[model samples]
Target: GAMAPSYRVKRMDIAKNDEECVVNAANPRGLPGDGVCKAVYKKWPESFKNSATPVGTAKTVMCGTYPVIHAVGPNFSNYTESEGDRELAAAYREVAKEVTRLGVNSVAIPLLSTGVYSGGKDRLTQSLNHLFTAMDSTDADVVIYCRDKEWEKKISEAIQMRT
Candidate 1:
């Protein structure tokens, strides 16, 4: 049987709203001023602070009042053919789990592996989806912030089809 629709799909530009907690799904160096940082600070100025790193990575900080999650590291692209991608995905989930633990209700993310990390669209999306799905009690509405049009489309489409 065809899969019955379950989750509610909302389509809209994240920039149009004022979100207090935003996640950067990008790396640490990218979350200061431009890109996702501005959108977050415009709403919750004090909340943005670079904090938290992915599991198994060293001092890898992500999340701020800007509530950013810099790219999951230990070297992004986890080779799907091996257990590497799974391990990286689990580490990333730990990062997200920590975010919810810190009490952030709403969040934003970006294509982690799409950039300097590793993997192509499918691989990146698969890893990200794994992280997103493993979230618990994260009633937080995740607003994915894309740095470019390609990611925007790819992520949006993937979310539509899979998430």
Candidate 2:
């Protein structure tokens, strides 16, 4: 078996990605509010029903063709920055593990918690390293889908930070 599946950071609307599964950061009820989750909700509103996610964990919502992995990330609005970072990191690790456990062959994930949930991009930059490291948990072809080009730079910086 191949230990490492191909991974790349790309700019895209995660909801429209061709990956077998798409990751969306949501609240407890897995309801889409703003950011990346919004588009997915717009695309498949029915998927949100009966899909509640525990913070720091993930829940998959089976939709028309592909599954939506709703990862409940920590909202920094009510948490200390460090706590939010740790929680978000845990969420990422859990999602990667979930894909392996669920047998998803390909997945596209956006920058979780870096939206309104965390305030700014720094939290994501700090945690992206942890995020990529967790990718090894699954053999799925992983794409760190970002909406902004700035985030792509952040991803690049995070990659070089530890290497």
Candidate 3:
């Protein structure tokens, strides 16, 4: 099936239905401790937990701190040419495990590999689709947020088509 949501590449915000975690598309390197982790850290203190995973060209550092499961992709740079998409899937799978292991019902996520280091649009959609597939469906809700039109469109469309 084709993706849903129009092309607006912006930051779209979302939250899980059963959990308090909030998700958004943002830069991992940009927000020091202020990435999704920071938000969840500050907002949901109890539901926070984390782990790191790497597989091929994809990398993700999973942090589940309630109200959200924050997974930041590896920095995209000309020199550090590896953003572990496979690893991100692994990380998300782990995050889901922890979400269950910890008895939490929600996890928040971002559209990895779509930042300055990563290419743009299409690549972002592909990578995010991979992440979504890795995530298992359950009572836990998966929410992705985009900050701009392009991001919002890309993420929303990917979700419609893939998730």
Candidate 4:
């Protein structure tokens, strides 16, 4: 049987996603600084402790109710577009594997490293494609969260073109 790749972009912050798990865009050092990482850390400060989750990899943090998956995305300050592309794709792949590994029914993920990491519009578009494409391997309901109206619209457009 054939499967349809599925995911929707939501106009809200990931901290309010309420999915079984949320993927935070983590820094290479795996510490909370700003953006979704700050929000996630505010909720679960115990998760990150002298940690380092290198780019393209992920690590899970267990909360009392659900877990948070920290995915390290490419930093343009350090990587070129080609290298960033590989890291972005790998980040989603790792997130997909983590979802299946944790047996979650649903998960939420945002555009990783497109923020202060300076991946920009190019990364945003490419990251959206990579994430949705990764959805083919999982049965979980996935929501791609974003709080900005403009970004949400772009996210929607990016996903539609993913087909």
**Can you write out model 3's per-residue Cα lDDT over 1-163, one digit (the tens) per residue?**
1122222223533432233444433333324244444554454444333323232222223334333444545544432343355444554555555445445444555666555535343466566656556654434555555556666765666556733
> Cα deviation of 24 in candidate 1 (Å)?
4.5
Regions more than 4 Å wrong, model 2? 1-4, 157-163
**Local distance difference test, each candidate:** 0.48, 0.77, 0.45, 0.80
lDDT of 3 at 156: 67
Model 1, 32-114: lDDT tens digits are 34444456445444443453444333122333334434444434454544555665566556556656665655554543454
Span of 10 residues, lowest total lDDT, candidate 2 = 120-129
Cα lDDT over the full model 3:
0.45
C-alpha TM-scores of all predictions: 0.54, 0.86, 0.55, 0.87
lDDT of 4 at 150: 89
How would you order the candidates by lDDT, starting with the best? 4, 2, 1, 3
Q: Candidate 1 — which residues are off by over 4 angstroms?
A: 1-18, 24-71, 76-81, 119-122
Please state the error at residue 150 of candidate 3 in Å: 2.6
Which residue pairs show collisions in model 4?
none
| Candidate 1 global lDDT | 0.48
Ranking by TM-score: 4, 2, 3, 1
Query: What count of clashes does model 4 give?
Result: 0
RMSD of each: 6.7, 2.3, 7.0, 2.8
Compared with the true structure, what per-residue lDDT tens digits does model 4 show for residues 82-153? Answer: 887888889889998889899888888888877888744546667777887776768887888887888888
